[PDB]
Protein backbone atom coordinates (compact mmCIF):
# COMPACT_ATOMS: atom_id res chain seq x y z
CA UNK A 1 0.00 0.00 0.00
CA UNK A 2 1.38 3.19 -1.76
CA UNK A 3 0.28 5.43 1.95
CA UNK A 4 -0.40 4.53 5.31
CA UNK A 5 -3.74 3.39 6.10
CA UNK A 6 -4.55 5.72 9.50
CA UNK A 7 -4.88 5.61 13.23
CA UNK A 8 -8.40 3.02 13.24
CA UNK A 9 -11.87 5.24 14.19
CA UNK A 10 -10.45 8.59 13.81
CA UNK A 11 -8.29 8.05 16.76
CA UNK A 12 -5.14 9.94 15.90
CA UNK A 13 -4.39 12.59 18.03
CA UNK A 14 -4.94 16.48 16.74
CA UNK A 15 -1.78 18.39 16.16
CA UNK A 16 -0.86 22.03 14.57
CA UNK A 17 1.60 23.27 12.45
CA UNK A 18 1.68 27.06 13.28
CA UNK A 19 3.39 28.75 10.77
CA UNK A 20 4.58 32.06 12.71
CA UNK A 21 7.39 32.81 14.98
CA UNK A 22 8.18 30.09 17.51
CA UNK A 23 9.24 31.13 21.14
CA UNK A 24 10.87 28.55 22.94
CA UNK A 25 8.71 28.01 26.49
CA UNK A 26 4.89 27.85 27.83
CA UNK A 27 3.08 30.10 29.12
CA UNK A 28 1.82 30.85 32.69
CA UNK A 29 -1.33 32.36 33.59
CA UNK A 30 -2.34 32.70 36.92
CA UNK A 31 -5.89 33.23 38.73
CA UNK A 32 -7.14 33.71 42.25
CA UNK A 33 -7.94 30.63 44.43
CA UNK A 34 -8.97 30.95 48.20
CA UNK A 35 -6.61 29.89 50.67
CA UNK A 36 -7.95 26.49 52.37
CA UNK A 37 -10.61 26.07 49.97
CA UNK A 38 -10.24 22.73 49.26
CA UNK A 39 -13.64 21.80 47.06
CA UNK A 40 -13.66 24.13 44.52
CA UNK A 41 -10.72 22.64 42.36
CA UNK A 42 -12.46 18.69 43.12
CA UNK A 43 -14.67 19.68 39.79
CA UNK A 44 -13.74 18.86 36.45
CA UNK A 45 -15.55 22.18 34.66
CA UNK A 46 -13.58 23.77 36.93
CA UNK A 47 -9.86 22.27 36.77
CA UNK A 48 -10.61 22.64 32.70
CA UNK A 49 -11.82 26.26 32.35
CA UNK A 50 -13.68 27.46 35.07
CA UNK A 51 -10.80 28.75 36.70
CA UNK A 52 -10.61 31.51 34.12
CA UNK A 53 -14.03 32.45 35.27
CA UNK A 54 -12.22 33.87 38.70
CA UNK A 55 -10.19 37.35 38.50
CA UNK A 56 -6.57 36.96 36.40
CA UNK A 57 -3.47 37.76 38.70
CA UNK A 58 -0.95 38.05 36.16
CA UNK A 59 1.05 36.06 33.64
CA UNK A 60 4.70 35.33 33.17
CA UNK A 61 5.60 33.63 29.26
CA UNK A 62 8.43 31.74 28.28
CA UNK A 63 8.75 29.32 30.92
CA UNK A 64 10.65 25.72 29.90
CA UNK A 65 11.13 24.93 33.68
CA UNK A 66 7.73 23.69 34.88
CA UNK A 67 7.63 21.27 37.94
CA UNK A 68 6.25 22.87 40.93
CA UNK A 69 7.84 22.78 44.10
CA UNK A 70 6.91 25.36 46.89
CA UNK A 71 7.57 25.42 50.61
CA UNK A 72 6.91 27.45 53.03
CA UNK A 73 8.48 29.16 55.47
CA UNK A 74 9.77 28.31 59.02
CA UNK A 75 10.08 31.69 61.04
CA UNK A 76 12.89 30.20 63.31
CA UNK A 77 15.99 31.23 65.41
CA UNK A 78 18.11 31.47 63.15
CA UNK A 79 16.03 33.26 60.73
CA UNK A 80 13.17 32.31 57.74
CA UNK A 81 13.64 29.64 55.49
CA UNK A 82 11.74 27.40 53.13
CA UNK A 83 11.12 23.95 55.25
CA UNK A 84 10.71 20.85 52.73
CA UNK A 85 7.48 18.91 53.56
CA UNK A 86 9.12 15.83 54.48
CA UNK A 87 11.49 17.59 57.17
CA UNK A 88 8.57 19.54 58.86
CA UNK A 89 7.22 17.67 61.98
CA UNK A 90 5.06 18.06 65.28
CA UNK A 91 3.34 21.48 66.15
CA UNK A 92 5.54 22.71 63.88
CA UNK A 93 9.17 21.95 63.37
CA UNK A 94 11.69 21.76 60.71
CA UNK A 95 14.86 19.36 60.85
CA UNK A 96 17.41 21.25 61.33
CA UNK A 97 15.59 24.66 61.98
CA UNK A 98 13.74 23.67 65.49
CA UNK A 99 10.37 24.98 66.10
CA UNK A 100 8.62 27.86 63.71
CA UNK A 101 6.55 30.21 65.38
CA UNK A 102 4.69 30.93 62.12
CA UNK A 103 1.06 29.52 61.16
CA UNK A 104 1.24 26.64 58.37
CA UNK A 105 -2.50 28.01 57.58
CA UNK A 106 -2.20 31.47 56.49
CA UNK A 107 -1.13 33.04 52.91
CA UNK A 108 2.30 33.32 51.80
CA UNK A 109 3.84 35.79 49.29
CA UNK A 110 6.89 34.58 46.87
CA UNK A 111 7.94 34.62 43.88
CA UNK A 112 8.55 30.80 43.60
CA UNK A 113 6.51 30.27 40.95
CA UNK A 114 7.98 31.16 37.58
CA UNK A 115 9.20 34.46 39.08
CA UNK A 116 5.90 35.49 39.74
CA UNK A 117 4.70 37.50 42.90
CA UNK A 118 1.64 35.97 43.99
CA UNK A 119 0.38 33.53 47.06
CA UNK A 120 1.95 29.76 46.16
CA UNK A 121 -0.11 29.00 48.96
CA UNK A 122 -3.28 29.49 46.85
CA UNK A 123 -3.51 29.78 43.49
CA UNK A 124 -4.46 27.86 40.15
CA UNK A 125 -2.33 28.43 37.39
CA UNK A 126 -2.85 27.06 33.81
CA UNK A 127 0.79 26.87 31.46
CA UNK A 128 -0.06 26.44 27.78
CA UNK A 129 2.12 25.89 24.76
CA UNK A 130 2.90 22.99 22.06
CA UNK A 131 4.91 20.39 22.48
CA UNK A 132 7.44 19.04 19.97
CA UNK A 133 8.16 15.12 19.47
CA UNK A 134 11.55 14.66 18.40
CA UNK A 135 10.40 10.92 18.15
CA UNK A 136 7.27 9.51 16.90
CA UNK A 137 5.46 7.05 19.02
CA UNK A 138 4.10 6.55 22.52
CA UNK A 139 4.70 8.83 25.08
CA UNK A 140 3.81 8.87 28.55
CA UNK A 141 3.52 12.24 30.66
CA UNK A 142 3.26 11.85 34.23
CA UNK A 143 2.69 13.77 37.79
CA UNK A 144 4.81 12.06 40.43
CA UNK A 145 2.86 13.69 43.18
CA UNK A 146 -0.51 15.93 43.03
CA UNK A 147 -0.43 18.94 45.77
CA UNK A 148 -3.35 20.00 45.85
CA UNK A 149 -5.17 19.21 41.98
CA UNK A 150 -4.14 18.96 38.87
CA UNK A 151 -4.64 18.02 35.04
CA UNK A 152 -2.40 18.07 31.74
CA UNK A 153 -3.95 17.53 28.32
CA UNK A 154 -2.79 17.08 25.55
CA UNK A 155 -4.28 17.39 21.97
CA UNK A 156 -5.93 20.33 19.51
CA UNK A 157 -9.11 20.16 20.98
CA UNK A 158 -8.56 18.96 23.86
CA UNK A 159 -6.16 21.01 25.10
CA UNK A 160 -6.53 24.49 22.99
CA UNK A 161 -7.33 24.72 19.57
CA UNK A 162 -4.39 25.06 17.26
CA UNK A 163 -3.12 28.57 16.25
CA UNK A 164 -4.99 30.10 19.33
CA UNK A 165 -3.00 29.36 22.31
CA UNK A 166 -4.35 32.30 23.94
CA UNK A 167 -7.73 32.07 23.81
CA UNK A 168 -10.22 31.59 27.03
CA UNK A 169 -9.98 28.21 27.52
CA UNK A 170 -11.50 25.62 25.58
CA UNK A 171 -14.20 22.82 27.62
CA UNK A 172 -12.59 19.38 26.76
CA UNK A 173 -12.63 17.47 30.48
CA UNK A 174 -10.86 14.49 27.94
CA UNK A 175 -7.60 14.85 30.59
CA UNK A 176 -4.62 12.72 29.40
CA UNK A 177 -3.65 13.07 33.26
CA UNK A 178 -6.62 13.21 35.85
CA UNK A 179 -5.15 14.31 38.95
CA UNK A 180 -7.89 16.04 40.22
CA UNK A 181 -8.14 16.21 44.04
CA UNK A 182 -10.78 13.66 45.18
CA UNK A 183 -14.13 14.69 47.07
CA UNK A 184 -13.19 11.95 49.02
CA UNK A 185 -9.49 11.68 49.95
CA UNK A 186 -6.68 11.46 47.55
CA UNK A 187 -4.92 9.92 44.57
CA UNK A 188 -1.54 7.91 44.18
CA UNK A 189 1.50 8.74 43.32
CA UNK A 190 3.08 8.59 40.00
CA UNK A 191 -0.29 9.55 37.80
CA UNK A 192 -0.09 9.26 34.27
CA UNK A 193 -1.37 9.42 30.69
CA UNK A 194 0.30 8.41 27.62
CA UNK A 195 -0.01 10.03 23.42
CA UNK A 196 0.84 8.74 20.28
CA UNK A 197 2.93 11.65 18.26
CA UNK A 198 4.00 12.06 15.47
CA UNK A 199 7.53 14.07 15.14
CA UNK A 200 7.94 17.28 14.09
CA UNK A 201 3.93 17.96 14.80
CA UNK A 202 2.95 20.52 17.21
CA UNK A 203 0.77 19.25 19.87
CA UNK A 204 -0.96 21.53 22.10
CA UNK A 205 -0.19 21.67 26.09
CA UNK A 206 -2.18 22.42 29.16
CA UNK A 207 -1.67 21.98 32.77
CA UNK A 208 -3.70 23.17 34.98
CA UNK A 209 -2.40 23.02 38.89
CA UNK A 210 -4.14 24.39 41.96
CA UNK A 211 -3.24 24.70 45.94
CA UNK A 212 -5.20 25.87 48.90
CA UNK A 213 -3.11 25.20 51.54
CA UNK A 214 0.57 25.33 52.53
CA UNK A 215 2.76 23.41 50.57
CA UNK A 216 2.48 22.73 46.66
CA UNK A 217 4.01 20.27 44.19
CA UNK A 218 3.71 18.87 40.79
CA UNK A 219 6.81 16.99 39.62
CA UNK A 220 6.26 16.78 35.83
CA UNK A 221 7.57 14.34 33.53
CA UNK A 222 7.96 13.02 30.10
CA UNK A 223 9.17 9.58 29.13
CA UNK A 224 9.90 9.34 25.06
CA UNK A 225 9.50 7.06 22.55
CA UNK A 226 13.50 5.78 23.28
CA UNK A 227 12.40 4.90 26.87
CA UNK A 228 14.46 7.95 28.07
CA UNK A 229 13.00 10.76 30.68
CA UNK A 230 12.37 14.45 30.67
CA UNK A 231 11.86 15.92 33.97
CA UNK A 232 10.86 19.53 34.93
CA UNK A 233 13.10 21.20 32.25
CA UNK A 234 11.43 20.84 29.06
CA UNK A 235 13.59 23.08 27.09
CA UNK A 236 13.77 21.69 23.62
CA UNK A 237 10.48 20.23 23.72
CA UNK A 238 7.97 22.97 24.21
CA UNK A 239 7.38 26.21 22.40
CA UNK A 240 4.31 29.15 22.15
CA UNK A 241 2.96 31.02 19.32
CA UNK A 242 1.07 33.98 18.78
CA UNK A 243 -2.34 33.37 17.93
CA UNK A 244 -3.26 33.50 14.50
CA UNK A 245 -7.03 32.51 13.77
CA UNK A 246 -6.38 33.18 10.04
CA UNK A 247 -4.05 30.48 9.62
CA UNK A 248 -6.81 27.86 7.81
CA UNK A 249 -4.29 25.18 7.87
CA UNK A 250 -3.04 25.30 10.93
CA UNK A 251 -5.16 21.98 12.01
CA UNK A 252 -3.94 18.65 11.41
CA UNK A 253 -6.90 16.42 12.53
CA UNK A 254 -5.05 13.20 11.94
CA UNK A 255 -1.34 13.19 11.27
CA UNK A 256 -0.94 9.93 10.66
CA UNK A 257 -1.96 10.42 6.93
CA UNK A 258 -1.01 14.09 7.01
CL1 LIG B 1 10.97 31.18 52.99
CL1 LIG C 1 15.10 20.42 64.39
GD1 LIG D 1 12.55 23.46 38.40
GD1 LIG E 1 15.18 26.24 37.93
GD1 LIG F 1 10.36 25.87 43.33
GD1 LIG G 1 10.78 19.12 47.63
GD1 LIG H 1 10.97 28.68 41.30
GD1 LIG I 1 13.39 26.93 44.73
GD1 LIG J 1 13.09 26.33 41.11
GD1 LIG K 1 -11.88 21.76 17.28
GD1 LIG L 1 -1.13 21.91 49.63
GD1 LIG M 1 9.99 2.21 29.45
GD1 LIG N 1 15.58 23.44 40.53
GD1 LIG O 1 -0.41 37.47 21.80
Same mark, same amino acid.
Given at each position: ?????? #???????????????????????????? !??? #??????????????????? !?????????? #??????????? +?? =????????????????????????????????? !????????????????????????????? +??? =??????????????????????????????? =?????????????????? =??????????? !????? +????????????????????? #????????????????????????????
Amino acid at each position: GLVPRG #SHMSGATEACLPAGQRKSGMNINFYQYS !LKD #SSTYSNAAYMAYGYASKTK !LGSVGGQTDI #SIDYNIPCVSS +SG =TFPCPQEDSYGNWGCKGMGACSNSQGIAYWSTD !LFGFYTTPTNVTLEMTGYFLPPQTGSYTF +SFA =TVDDSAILSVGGSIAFECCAQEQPPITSTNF =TINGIKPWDGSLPDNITG =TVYMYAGYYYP !LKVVY +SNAVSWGTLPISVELPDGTTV #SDNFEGYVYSFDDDLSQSNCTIPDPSIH
